[PDB]
Design a binder for this molecule. Structure first.
Ligand SMILES: O=C(O)[C@H](CC1CC1)NC(=O)C1(c2ccc(Br)cc2)CCN(Cc2ccccc2C(F)(F)F)CC1
Ligand SMILES: O=C(O)[C@H](CC1CC1)NC(=O)C1(c2ccc(Br)cc2)CCN(Cc2ccccc2C(F)(F)F)CC1
Lengths: 86, 87
């Protein structure tokens, strides 16, 4: 089930997630942790184990975790995360 | 990638306290998604959300679906060894 959610960045330019995946032999990218009291956590749409498929209308295919973390961090104010629900 | 393994004691409900992810047509890798509170896996402390699972009791999970991996884990009674790569 695909989905998208726009999250407002906190004062430290974070949404509040950890990610995993996007390595050799393991292409897919996932939300690993959603931290308490962050935008992601308080929105409630995303959760551990949902698959990250895009950021602000662009695919994360082929990208590494550092790469995707930068794709998110570059985007100020708010960011849309495109996902598949576990 | 830091490989390891851990033998966990099954609870009275034949559980270790984990849910898992991946194991899919185009995302072949399998992961631990959640470690539930007050379970063998949570009380042991070795494994955590995001660790990749590579095998169960000396056998690989390569190519299996998550329902198959859950069945593999459930069939072993008493204790089971989870081979993993650490996040
Ligand atoms: O929350 C973001 O907007 C981003 C998003 C990117 C996609 C991970 N998260 C991060 O920058 C971090 C990260 C993780 C993996 C990689 Br690979 C890279 C970067 C994860 C979150 N922390 C801080 C953290 C630390 C401990 C508890 C809570 C928090 C906090 F987030 F502040 F709530 C900084 C690094
Ligand atoms: O803990 C296990 O030993 C196994 C291991 C298998 C590989 C997931 N886990 C499971 O049986 C479940 C499962 C998940 C995904 C698939 Br795909 C299939 C099965 C997850 C754990 N629950 C019970 C659960 C539910 C809610 C709160 C707590 C708990 C409890 F486990 F008691 F902590 C039963 C189903």
């Amino acid at each position: 089930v695909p989905g998208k959610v726009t999250l407002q960045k906190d004062a430290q330019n974070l949404i509040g997630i950890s990610i995993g995946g996007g390595a050799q032999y393991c292409p897919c990218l996932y939300i690993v942790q959603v931290f308490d009291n962050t935008p992601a956590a308080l929105d409630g749409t995303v959760a551990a184990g949902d698959e990250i498929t895009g950021v602000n209308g662009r695919s994360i295919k082929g990208k590494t975790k550092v790469e995707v973390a930068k794709m998110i961090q570059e985007v100020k104010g708010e960011v849309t995360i495109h996902y598949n629900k576990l």
